[PDB]
Amino acid sequence: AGAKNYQYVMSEQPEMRSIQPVHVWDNYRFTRFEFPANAELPQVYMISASGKETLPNSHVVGENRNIIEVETVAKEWRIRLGDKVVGVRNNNFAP
C-alpha cells in the first residue's frame, strides 16, 4: 500500500458513452478497470510494440464483478465491444 499514479484519458463521445469506462487505475503489478454495474463489460486491448491491437489476459473483480483487471501496463488502451469503441490513453506510465 503506497502512492499510485493513475493518469488516463478517453475520447469524449456521447455515442460511445454506453461502454464508456467509469474510472481506471493501474499499479506496479496489475491494472484495474472500473465499469458501470448496469452496463456490460467490454474487452480491453493493448497496442503491442509492433503496431497492432492485442487482447491481454483480463480478469474480473469487484462486489458486482463490474471490474476488469488486465495483466499488463501500457500507454494505449483500446476498449471494443459490439459496434462501439472507446479510445483510452495512459499519460504517466508508472512501471
Binding site: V9, Q13, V85
Partner: peptide, 22 residues
Amino acid sequence: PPPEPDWSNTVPVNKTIPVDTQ
C-alpha cells in the same frame, strides 16, 4: 454507426480518485 475515438474533448478516466478519506 462506426464509433471510432475522435478524442473530441478527451475526457480523463480519473475524477473520483480512490484514496478513501480518513
